[PDB]
Design an enzyme around this catalytic site. Structure first.
Site, mmCIF file in Angstrom:
data_model
loop_
_atom_site.group_PDB
_atom_site.id
_atom_site.type_symbol
_atom_site.label_atom_id
_atom_site.label_comp_id
_atom_site.label_asym_id
_atom_site.label_seq_id
_atom_site.Cartn_x
_atom_site.Cartn_y
_atom_site.Cartn_z
ATOM 1 C CE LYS A 154 -2.074 1.720 3.587
ATOM 2 N NZ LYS A 154 -1.892 3.181 3.408
ATOM 3 C CD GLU A 180 -0.514 7.412 9.506
ATOM 4 O OE1 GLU A 180 -1.543 6.709 9.508
ATOM 5 O OE2 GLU A 180 0.351 7.342 8.612
ATOM 6 N NE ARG A 181 -1.829 2.028 13.215
ATOM 7 C CZ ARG A 181 -2.440 0.975 12.687
ATOM 8 N NH1 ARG A 181 -2.237 -0.232 13.186
ATOM 9 N NH2 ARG A 181 -3.260 1.130 11.659
HETATM 10 N N1 LIG Z 1 7.059 -2.916 -6.682
HETATM 11 C C1 LIG Z 1 7.604 -3.618 -5.661
HETATM 12 N N2 LIG Z 1 8.807 -4.215 -5.789
HETATM 13 C C2 LIG Z 1 9.372 -4.919 -4.791
HETATM 14 N N3 LIG Z 1 8.788 -5.085 -3.593
HETATM 15 C C3 LIG Z 1 7.581 -4.543 -3.323
HETATM 16 C C4 LIG Z 1 6.905 -3.760 -4.365
HETATM 17 N N4 LIG Z 1 5.743 -3.344 -3.838
HETATM 18 C C5 LIG Z 1 5.678 -3.819 -2.567
HETATM 19 N N5 LIG Z 1 6.777 -4.529 -2.264
HETATM 20 C C6 LIG Z 1 7.050 -5.199 -0.970
HETATM 21 O O1 LIG Z 1 5.933 -5.079 -0.089
HETATM 22 C C7 LIG Z 1 6.388 -4.913 1.257
HETATM 23 C C8 LIG Z 1 5.452 -3.997 2.040
HETATM 24 O O2 LIG Z 1 5.631 -2.661 1.589
HETATM 25 P P1 LIG Z 1 4.742 -1.431 2.106
HETATM 26 O O3 LIG Z 1 3.443 -1.401 1.348
HETATM 27 O O4 LIG Z 1 5.643 -0.226 2.093
HETATM 28 O O5 LIG Z 1 4.380 -1.771 3.633
HETATM 29 P P2 LIG Z 1 2.840 -1.802 4.100
HETATM 30 O O6 LIG Z 1 2.184 -2.777 3.158
HETATM 31 O O7 LIG Z 1 2.900 -2.258 5.538
HETATM 32 O O8 LIG Z 1 2.381 -0.379 3.927
HETATM 33 C C9 LIG Z 1 7.809 -4.373 1.176
HETATM 34 O O9 LIG Z 1 8.684 -5.115 2.027
HETATM 35 C C10 LIG Z 1 8.223 -4.539 -0.269
HETATM 36 O O10 LIG Z 1 9.386 -5.365 -0.355
#
Ligand SMILES: Nc1ncnc2c1ncn2[C@@H]1O[C@H](COP(=O)(O)OP(=O)(O)O)[C@@H](O)[C@H]1O
Ligand SMILES: Nc1ncnc2c1ncn2[C@@H]1O[C@H](COP(=O)(O)OP(=O)(O)OP(=O)(O)O)[C@@H](O)[C@H]1O
Ligand SMILES: Nc1ncnc2c1ncn2[C@@H]1O[C@H](COP(=O)(O)OP(=O)(O)OP(=O)(O)O)[C@@H](O)[C@H]1O
Ligand SMILES: [Mg+2]
Ligand SMILES: [Mg+2]
EC number: 7.1.2.2
Lengths: 467, 53, 477, 508
Positions: A154, A180-181
């Site tokens: 996300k 927001e946390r």
């Molecule tokens: N385009 C992408 N390429 C590589 N890894 C991705 C990509 N999109 C998401 N990820 C992976 O998804 C994981 C979660 O990312 P993020 O969305 O920033 O955290 P959250 O989902 O908790 O907000 C990351 O560790 C990342 O490696």
């Protein structure tokens, strides 16, 4: 004008103005406070008394403290100098980088554009992402719901949308974080700094963050969406461009509204929500439109209580959404990124009258073939791969190639994929999927489509890995 | 006979699982309605008691 | 200060001002606040007056001066409104100038009694094959359109409105229908796009649009249906025919629930007050069909309801089903699958309009209904025939968008379908046949369709010529 | 309309000019008293949430300041308070003592010793209602908070500065998770590494005194009180004390966080603080919401849990982990308070009774458990083994339905079932027997490389036992290497391979 605090029940403060009353929604500042405390008026109880919801902790207030009537609602600093600056609901910076210097101030309680300040024709917002632009195009100036919200991408998707929209159309963006946390707020600040959408040095930022923390009283988490809307409305109107507004989370917006309504002493409605749920949501969601000057495209992260889609909160928010994206844990497992569920994603403008007949037909063909592959996967799991015909093994191959091609490498994730981010225009996406559906690339390997930009990159990858 | 019996059992179990899924969907909708109704009922009882003092 | 014709707002907050004064203010009378808003005086109490503000309470302040207008809540009505958009109080919001109307009608006026009315005898053409053949709607009827989120209800309403142009462009004053579209709690973007769509179809010259979008205070959404219904009652009582489309009547229920809860009224079932049934029946009992001793006018009503997850036995859907003269159940499963309009002909009925249906459509649609009913019960030989014919008909009733059909084309297409001419055509090509077939009859053979329309029946010679046309065309397809 | 100060006594006083001899600025006269709520007339210069003191030696917190009167909540039985009493300002919001002088002491919600070991040292005081840090002082969670439990440390890692949530039903093991976490920190506190020591605070809201006494005995047995504070707000305590005790604990921990050290606070149980606040709010005639809870109950828990931070080196680097415990009912994590605190915190350790009685104690239900911090709160060796363990367990959870059938299925699902059963039998743990990280990684490494695919599952819980002792006695150099180094070097990987094969090569 000066009044006195007469009562203090929790986060509700009753003030008394011997001279002249401030209209509803104004902001009053409590004089004699170590840190700025702002009270938003909400009622006129009579006898010159008003009832106000506090935007900060009311502990340590005394019956009699002087309260100064500002004369206008909460006014925040809006301009190009808010980009890259965090600031709470009442506009005070909270990133400790000094004051937000601007020559403009905007009141956060504004009205939706009149019936004549409204674009009469639909549009499409090209984000440069294959899956979003093909199976669920984002209408310009329309709300987009975003589901999933847990280690599925996300934040990376939000940052990529920010970057693409600030690179393609050149518009900026606002990130209003409602409830927001603080841990995740700091993490997001640093992720933006790393990826580059915020620049603390050269002042070339592309995001204005507005955090309504999770430990602020209910009267503050209910208004930060409005502060974000004001920051974005400046760019729409004054700068005359297309803005993005990320609201994370919208369920927290409704929940904070509910808490404020209960505190003021109002009978709850359906499932214990405020009686004003529909209007509380509408007054905000009706300022995210496509005026004749610019436009604001909002992206609400959405949480569905009890996994119940008919709960009044999502039942009321879904009435406003103009599209939908569904990040799925089941697709990040496959290494596909962005992990957007191609079939569960939805759009209102996926209509041949809006997106054009060719776009509509390509999208419908891709959806049909993906559904066919999904159905065939049961047969593969049970009767074994041998049982397929030859006009079904071909569809399985084509669907796997399409799944690979729907994945893309982001510019804000070059430290996760080792590739270089691609911003695929729309025509490139439509042509690529048209060619794959036609069968023009049935001779290539599936992995030649994984994590590539346009189709020509898939051709080059096939050449490079086969030779 | 054993080949046909196993095939028929596979088909019957598939249909039974499909019917259970439809019934689960209907009952989940009913459960959500009932849960919301119970929340509203208890809350209205509390409100009436509070306002009837 | 005159404490009889004027008062001072004792306490604003919640959207329910308490005023002190107005000693001579009638119940349900409209008062005007100093700032510019207007309100309706609900609770005439001994010591104050509870005025519901038709606007944003931000503009009102304790101390402001309320002045009684002297008339019960009423709205401007007449021919001057056609082609204009108006808020819930009759003030234009399309910026094309002042509304300029001579007559004002009360929004709370009572519905006609039992003697003025008369059975529904005229057909209200919607140009939707599924609606026109299987669930016909007469003039003066109240046909609920009940569905879900995005299932194509506003599409039914707008196709009806756009279809009325065949009659509103002709000369017969007895067939012209004036449409009214009340939009309640609905995105203003949608209303603007809808108005543009109507203007592009030359369908505003006889259409009023009343807006109470989601950014409009609850009292305006609660009052918009009544303003629209008075705007339509004008035509009904002046011997003309009107068609009002409330969209939705569930957003109005939510607005009224907010209004009631903020007034501290006893919540009932789903927190809705006890007046919701009265709220909607008061409104839908005005869609009458006057008899010739009262003018002979009519006012059709097409209320729209949005069920939740397909729940038709909810509270508000059941109220409005107990108020209206039929249903048009739009099913989300069908809509997503591919059938559009997704009308669930199994559960959708029209009690009244069955006798208003046109003879030419009557005879063909009778056998269509029997065939579809038989197909519904089997989903060898006769079974295969029923499946085939039912699938042909179901693919025949699919329709485009914003492309309504005249009754004669519907007759031609359904006749081709039910008489078994497509029983050999592959089930997928039916639409491709349909859209083609019409063009043929819409070009060369206008005389046949015109004769069917004028005579109002498929005469035996018309039957024979239509048989020839369809068989010859199917020969070369 | 009517007011509560319009009683004929006040009007009588004011009619004959007797209201000038009474100091209605720093003193007040109780108008009403009942069910622990007093309504006081006067105290015109009293601040919200300030502590007033009644004539009969009791204390109270002034919560509702209305135009007519002040609503004080009494800190004890309202037996001693009578209408007409005299209430004096204290002048200061409620605060509690803090410092290392509390370690090993049982205190009540207000910092008064209740263990009869003498006065409480107390050099510094701290207000219980202090705003948490901001977006800037914090920095991302990185260091691990060693729970000593194989499941929690392997599949639900908890960092430092994180807010986990031990959510479960009644009698499932929540307090056991908390006590094992508290007891496992002795191996760090005894040592000399000053950045690994964790000080523990156990807030006991609404538990009977016998339970807390047994718990203190349990900690003393494990010699884990010399670095533990216990803040008791038992059932007999007045509702305001149960309401405050989490905040007293959080401030006693914020002291350690501010002064560069690391603390762990276990609000056990938060669902009882919510009930105490609900009582106080309903007796103060505040508008109820869902389930009768006041509107600002999410606020109540968020302003408490958002004080668990990981300060950055420019502020000291200290941290305050929080482990709130919530008792769900049937299994309804969609209730009101469970929902609030699930949306506030950073994860959840979700315990079951089905698993508890199936023999999987601790009953941590993986799949529903989560840690949005994740691998960032794990050591390199634990990462290496836990990635594979988590992947294999996830594969096993989607084919667990076939377990009864098992046979008459392909070989892949046979292997998945076998490996999953071995891994689940590995995650089983005793009680009050935490494990150092090196022991956990050794055991899980043996488990996830197939070296137990020959042993029968009933024997695994024995293998795990005996094997562990072996390495803990014969091979200390390898364990020390893994510990201090933090990772599994190729040489250490080979040594583990040889050790596991040699021990397994002769087991029986
Ligand atoms: N385009 C992408 N390429 C590589 N890894 C991705 C990509 N999109 C998401 N990820 C992976 O998804 C994981 C979660 O990312 P993020 O969305 O920033 O955290 P959250 O989902 O908790 O907000 C990351 O560790 C990342 O490696
Ligand atoms: N006859 C039709 N053929 C093809 N598509 C249709 C048809 N009718 C409706 N749709 C599609 O359904 C979508 C929603 O239609 P419509 O607005 O009529 O439903 P609605 O119930 O009014 O939606 P909402 O409940 O959001 O107001 C439109 O974007 C349109 O593309
Ligand atoms: N891993 C374990 N192995 C063996 N026994 C255990 C384990 N965990 C918990 N128990 C036992 O289960 C019983 C209940 O555990 P505990 O009291 O810690 O759960 P709880 O949820 O805190 O109970 P309550 O919430 O009702 O206070 C205790 O007697 C404890 O000894
Ligand atoms: Mg609609
Ligand atoms: Mg316990």
């Amino acid at each position: 004008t000066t009044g006195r605090i007469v009562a203090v029940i929790g986060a509700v403060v009753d003030v008394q103005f011997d001279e002249g009353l401030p209209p509803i929604l104004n902001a009053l500042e409590v004089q004699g406070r170590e840190t700025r405390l702002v009270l938003e008026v909400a009622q006129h109880l009579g006898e010159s008394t008003v009832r106000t919801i506090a935007m900060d902790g009311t502990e340590g207030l005394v019956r009699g403290q002087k309260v100064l009537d500002s004369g206008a609602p909460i006014r925040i600093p809006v301009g190009p100098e808010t980009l890259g600056r965090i600031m709470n609901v009442i506009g005070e910076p909270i990133d400790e980088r000094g004051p937000i210097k601007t020559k403009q101030f905007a009141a956060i309680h504004a009205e939706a554009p009149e019936f004549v300040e409204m674009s009469v024709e639909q549009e499409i917002l090209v984000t440069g992402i294959k899956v979003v632009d093909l199976l669920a195009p984002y209408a310009k100036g329309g709300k987009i719901g975003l589901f999933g919200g847990a280690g599925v991408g996300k934040t990376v998707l939000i940052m990529e949308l920010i970057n693409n929209v600030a690179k393609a159309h050149g518009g900026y963006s606002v990130f209003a974080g409602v409830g927001e946390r603080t841990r995740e707020g700091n993490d997001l600040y640093h992720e933006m700094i790393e990826s580059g959408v915020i620049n603390l040095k050269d002042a070339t930022s592309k995001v204005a963050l507005v955090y309504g923390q999770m430990n602020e009283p209910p009267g503050a988490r209910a208004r930060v969406a409005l502060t974000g809307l004001t920051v974005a409305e400046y760019f729409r109107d004054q700068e005359g461009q297309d803005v993005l507004l990320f609201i994370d989370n919208i369920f927290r917006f409704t929940q904070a509204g509910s808490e404020v309504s209960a505190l003021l002493g109002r009978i709850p409605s359906a499932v214990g929500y405020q009686p004003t749920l529909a209007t509380d949501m509408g007054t905000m969601q009706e300022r995210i439109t496509t005026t004749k000057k610019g436009s604001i495209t909002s992206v609400q992260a959405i949480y569905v209580p009890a996994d119940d889609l008919t709960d009044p909160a999502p039942a009321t928010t879904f009435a406003h959404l103009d599209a939908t994206t569904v990040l799925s844990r089941a697709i990040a497992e496959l290494g596909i990124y962005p992990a957007v569920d191609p079939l569960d994603s939805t759009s209102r403008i996926m209509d041949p009258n809006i997106v054009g007949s060719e776009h509509y037909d390509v999208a419908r063909g891709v959806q049909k073939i993906l559904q066919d592959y999904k159905s065939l996967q049961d047969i593969i799991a049970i009767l074994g791969m041998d049982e397929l015909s030859e006009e079904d093994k071909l569809t399985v191959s084509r669907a796997r190639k399409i799944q690979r091609f729907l994945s893309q490498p982001f510019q804000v994730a070059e430290v996760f994929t080792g590739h270089l981010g691609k911003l695929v225009p729309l025509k490139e996406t439509i042509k690529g999927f048209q060619q794959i559906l036609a069968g023009e690339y049935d001779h290539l390997p599936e992995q030649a489509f994984y994590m590539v930009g346009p189709i020509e990159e898939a051709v080059a990858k096939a050449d490079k890995l086969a030779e | 006979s054993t080949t046909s019996e196993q095939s028929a059992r596979m088909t019957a179990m598939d249909n039974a699982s499909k019917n259970a899924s439809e019934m689960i969907d209907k009952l989940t909708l009913t459960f959500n309605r009932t849960r919301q109704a119970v929340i509203t009922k208890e809350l209205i009882e509390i409100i009436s008691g509070a306002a009837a003092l | 200060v005159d404490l009889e014709e004027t008062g001072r707002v004792l306490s604003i907050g919640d959207g329910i001002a308490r005023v002190h004064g107005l000693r001579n203010v009638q119940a349900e009378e409209m008062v005007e606040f100093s700032s510019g808003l207007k309100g309706m005086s609900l609770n005439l109490e001994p010591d104050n007056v509870g005025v519901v503000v038709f606007g944003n309470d931000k503009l009102i302040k304790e101390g402001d001066i309320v002045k009684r207008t002297g008339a019960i809540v009423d709205v401007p009505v007449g021919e001057e409104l056609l082609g204009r958009v108006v808020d819930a109080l009759g003030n234009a919001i399309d910026g094309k100038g002042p509304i300029g109307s001579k007559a004002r009608r009360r929004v709370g006026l009572k519905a006609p009694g039992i003697i003025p009315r008369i059975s529904v005898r005229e057909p209200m053409q919607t140009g939707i094959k599924a609606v026109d053949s299987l669930v016909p709607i007469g003039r003066g009827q109240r046909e609920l359109i009940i569905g879900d989120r995005q299932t194509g209800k506003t599409s039914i309403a707008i196709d009806t409105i756009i279809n009325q142009k065949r009659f509103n462009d002709g000369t017969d004053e007895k067939k012209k229908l004036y449409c009214i579209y009340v939009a309640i709690g609905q995105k203003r973007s949608t209303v603007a796009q809808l108005v543009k769509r109507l203007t592009d179809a030359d369908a505003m010259k006889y259409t009023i649009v009343v807006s109470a979008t989601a950014s409009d205070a609850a009292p305006l959404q609660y009052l918009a249906p009544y303003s629209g219904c008075s705007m339509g009652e004008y035509f009904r009582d002046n011997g003309k025919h009107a068609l009002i489309i409330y969209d939705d009547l569930s957003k109005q229920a939510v607005a009224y629930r907010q209004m009631s809860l903020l007034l501290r009224r006893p919540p009932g079932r789903e927190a809705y007050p006890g007046d919701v049934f009265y709220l909607h029946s008061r409104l839908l009992e005005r869609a009458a069909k006057m008899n010739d001793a009262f003018g002979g006018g009519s006012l059709t009503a097409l209320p729209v309801i949005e069920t939740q997850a397909g729940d038709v036995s909810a509270y508000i859907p059941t109220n409005v089903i107990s108020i209206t003269d039929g249903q048009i159940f739009l099913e989300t499963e069908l809509f997503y699958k591919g059938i559009r309009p997704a009308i669930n002909v199994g559960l959708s009925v029209s009690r009244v309009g069955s006798a208003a249906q046109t003879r030419a459509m009557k005879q063909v649609a009778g056998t269509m209904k029997l065939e579809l009913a038989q197909y519904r019960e089997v989903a060898d030989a006769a079974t295969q025939q029923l499946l085939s014919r039912g699938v042909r008909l179901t693919e025949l009733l699919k329709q485009g968008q914003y492309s309504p059909m005249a009754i004669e084309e519907q007759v031609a297409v359904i006749y081709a379908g039910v008489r078994g001419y497509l029983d050999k055509l592959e089930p997928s090509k039916i639409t491709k046949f349909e859209n083609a077939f019409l063009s043929h009859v819409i070009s060369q053979h206008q005389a046949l369709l015109g004769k069917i329309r004028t005579d109002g029946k498929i005469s035996e010679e018309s039957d024979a010529k239509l048989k020839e046309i369809v068989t010859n065309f199917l020969a070369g397809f």
